Structure 1
Amino acid sequence: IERGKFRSLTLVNWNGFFARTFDLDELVTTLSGGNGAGKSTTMAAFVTALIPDLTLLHFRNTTEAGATSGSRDKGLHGKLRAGVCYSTLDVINSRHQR
Structure 2
Amino acid sequence: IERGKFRSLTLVNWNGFFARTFDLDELVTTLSGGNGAGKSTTMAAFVTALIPDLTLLHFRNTTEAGATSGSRDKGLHGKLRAGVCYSTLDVINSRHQRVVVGVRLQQVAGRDRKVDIKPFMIQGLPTAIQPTQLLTENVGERQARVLP
Range into which the TM-score falls when normalised by the shorter chain: over 0.9
Structure with the higher fraction of residues in strand conformation: 2
Question: For the residues of structure 2 that align with 1:66 and 1:87, how far apart are their CA atoms?
Answer: 27
Evaluate the alpha carbon distance shift between residue 23 and residue 86 of structure 1 in structure 2; reply closer, same or farther with a 3 A threshold.
same
* Structure 1 position 66, deviation (Å): 2.3
Q: Deviations over 1:47-76 (max 9, x none)?
A: 000000001000000100121445300000
Question: For the residues of structure 2 that align with 1:55 and 1:61, how far apart are their CA atoms?
Answer: 18
Aligned length: 96
Question: For the residues of structure 1 that align with 2:70 and 2:27, how far apart are their CA atoms?
Answer: 37
Q: Which runs of 4+ in 1 moved over 4 A?
A: none
| 1:4-43 → structure 2 map (5 Å cutoff) | 4-43=4-43
CA contact (8 A) 1:60 1:66 kept: no
| Aligned residues with identical type, % of pairs | 100
Question: For the residues of structure 2 that align with 1:70 and 1:95, how far apart are their CA atoms?
Answer: 42
Q: Deviations over 1:69-93 (max 9, x none)?
A: 4530000000000000000000000
Return 5+ residue gaps in structure 1 as ranges: none
Q: Secondary structure at the match of 2:29?
A: strand
Return 5+ residue gaps in structure 2 as ranges: 97-148
* Structure 1 position 28, deviation (Å): 0.3
- Relative to the length of structure 2, the TM-score reads 0.63
Question: For the residues of structure 1 that align with 2:68 and 2:95, how far apart are their CA atoms?
Answer: 43
Q: Deviations over 1:10-39 (max 9, x none)?
A: 000000000000000000000000000100
Q: Which has the larger radius of gyration?
A: 2
Question: For the residues of structure 1 that align with 2:70 and 2:43, how far apart are their CA atoms?
Answer: 22
CA RMSD of aligned residues (A): 0.9
Match of 1:91 in 2: 91
Question: For the residues of structure 1 that align with 2:43 and 2:2, how far apart are their CA atoms?
Answer: 26
Evaluate the alpha carbon distance shift between residue 37 and residue 25 of structure 1 in structure 2; reply closer, same or farther with a 3 A threshold.
same
